Design an enzyme around this catalytic site. Structure first.
Site, PDB file in Angstrom:
ATOM      1  N   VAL A 219       0.768  -1.424   0.223  1.00 31.07           N
ATOM      2  CA  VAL A 219       0.036   0.217  -0.097  1.00 31.07           C
ATOM      3  C   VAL A 219       0.694   1.652  -0.033  1.00 31.07           C
ATOM      4  O   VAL A 219       2.259   0.629   0.949  1.00 31.07           O
ATOM      5  CB  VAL A 219      -0.932   0.082   0.707  1.00 31.07           C
ATOM      6  CG1 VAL A 219      -2.362  -1.341   0.534  1.00 31.07           C
ATOM      7  CG2 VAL A 219       0.006  -0.072   2.889  1.00 31.07           C
ATOM      8  N   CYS A 220       0.094   2.370  -0.776  1.00 30.05           N
ATOM      9  CA  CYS A 220       1.350   3.506  -0.523  1.00 30.05           C
ATOM     10  C   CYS A 220       0.949   4.744  -0.242  1.00 30.05           C
ATOM     11  O   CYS A 220      -0.345   5.090  -0.430  1.00 30.05           O
ATOM     12  CB  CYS A 220       2.644   3.367  -2.243  1.00 30.05           C
ATOM     13  SG  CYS A 220       2.729   1.608  -2.857  1.00 30.05           S
ATOM     14  N   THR A 221       1.492   5.985  -0.582  1.00 30.13           N
ATOM     15  CA  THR A 221       0.787   7.453  -0.244  1.00 30.13           C
ATOM     16  C   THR A 221       2.311   8.068  -1.503  1.00 30.13           C
ATOM     17  O   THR A 221       2.646   7.637  -2.850  1.00 30.13           O
ATOM     18  CB  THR A 221       1.540   7.837   1.117  1.00 30.13           C
ATOM     19  OG1 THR A 221       2.653   7.618   1.157  1.00 30.13           O
ATOM     20  CG2 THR A 221       1.181   6.834   2.190  1.00 30.13           C
TER      21      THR A 221
ATOM     22  N   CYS B 289       5.808   3.510   0.157  1.00 30.45           N
ATOM     23  CA  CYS B 289       4.924   2.086   0.631  1.00 30.45           C
ATOM     24  C   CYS B 289       5.465   1.370   1.450  1.00 30.45           C
ATOM     25  O   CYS B 289       6.509   1.180   1.553  1.00 30.45           O
ATOM     26  CB  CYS B 289       5.247   2.206  -1.150  1.00 30.45           C
ATOM     27  SG  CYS B 289       4.779   2.193  -2.420  1.00 30.45           S
TER      28      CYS B 289
ATOM     29  N   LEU C  24      -3.237   1.782  -4.839  1.00 28.22           N
ATOM     30  CA  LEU C  24      -2.191   1.583  -3.848  1.00 28.22           C
ATOM     31  C   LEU C  24      -2.768   2.437  -2.609  1.00 28.22           C
ATOM     32  O   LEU C  24      -1.865   2.484  -1.176  1.00 28.22           O
ATOM     33  CB  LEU C  24      -1.219   2.138  -3.813  1.00 28.22           C
ATOM     34  CG  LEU C  24      -0.189   1.021  -5.193  1.00 28.22           C
ATOM     35  CD1 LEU C  24       0.702   1.979  -5.724  1.00 28.22           C
ATOM     36  CD2 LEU C  24       0.324  -0.150  -5.463  1.00 28.22           C
TER      37      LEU C  24
END
Lengths: 163, 163
Positions: free
Chosen positions: B47-49, B53, B142
């Site tokens: 999962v990322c911003t 990640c 993501l």
């Protein structure tokens, strides 16, 4: 056309590996060694006999082959990355997620346990010239291949090349 | 027809869980509680911003919901069994391997990173009568959902039912 047999030329393909790196069969063969294609139904699935099933997977025996081992399933790169890492596998695992390679190689199960288009358990040893030197296919998916035999064959082909 | 919106009735399906047990939506709803359908692209994916990640997956927060949580991806039961076990997940994970449910729910990516027909990140909260009480969908895969918010909503629906 969409058929791979002994003595014939292996068809080319590009599949992402576990790290999403595009891996091409012909580019691999230009590296100078034979390729061992190993198709398998599913990452994290057991192998069975009469009634005794286990996770005693001898796939790592293939690292002993003087050939480039490319292990293919329809599992995603992310799932193959976990499987590679958990089993400390030294060879590339390729994702045939879109089924192109299993259709191309004629190595599929139309429906395995309700799951459509799963890879069959199969081995192909491809010479750097592109020609198929060894072929093994099974109709039973829980029937794990003889990896030690695949290494013996791979090494024999590899040796003949440098004669 | 193949479209699920707020207020409308959720279409029925049967998908194998991680243990190959056929799980049917309407049979689940007859158990008396709402169902939380959670679609996700791939087991073992981060999962990322902005650029950071991680594998900090807060999916287990859903176990706090007084609802039957059914988490769906196109990954195989064997891959979902490993993911369930590794993350100690208390809810069922269902395999939409043949893409029927993601087509039925209109929750798919035609091509995600070269992979065709991957589930989109989406949530649906289905009342025991079959009606869709909550819906959330994203175009970014993501972008992990707010699970704590899904639990708040699920509990609010569950509570209204017993009023």
């Amino acid at each position: 056309k969409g058929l791979v047999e002994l003595g014939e030329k292996a068809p080319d393909f590009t599949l992402p590996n576990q790290d999403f790196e595009p891996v091409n069969l012909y580019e691999v063969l230009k590296r100078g060694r034979p390729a061992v294609l190993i198709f398998f139904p599913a990452a994290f699935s057991p192998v069975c006999t009469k009634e005794l099933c286990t996770f005693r997977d001898k796939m790592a025996q293939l690292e002993k082959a003087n050939a480039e081992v490319l292990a293919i399933s329809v599992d995603s790169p992310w799932c193959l990355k976990k499987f590679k890492d958990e089993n400390r596998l030294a060879f590339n695992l390729l994702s045939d997620y879109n089924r192109e390679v299993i259709k191309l190689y004629n190595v599929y199960h139309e429906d395995l346990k309700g799951l459509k288009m799963v890879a069959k358990r199969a081995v192909f040893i491809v010479k750097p010239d592109g020609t198929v030197a060894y072929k093994w296919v099974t109709d039973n998916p829980l029937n794990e291949p003889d990896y030690d035999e695949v290494v013996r064959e791979a090494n024999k082909i590899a040796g003949e090349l440098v004669a």
